[PDB]
């Protein structure tokens, strides 16, 4: 069930937000 990259869009959606967010990570991790 697949409209128009819908899931595809999802799957971007969630891990580029996760993998802002490791980057985020990866940024403090050496500051902590």
């Known amino acids: 069930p697949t409209d128009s990259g ?3 869009t ?5 891990l580029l937000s ?3 967010f490791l ?3 990866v940024e ?3 500051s902590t």
């Open 10 to 14: 999802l799957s971007i959606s969630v």
């Open 28 to 30: 403090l991790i050496p």
């Open 18 to 20: 996760l993998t802002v």
């Open 6 to 8: 819908e899931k595809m």
């Open 23 to 25: 980057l985020v990570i």
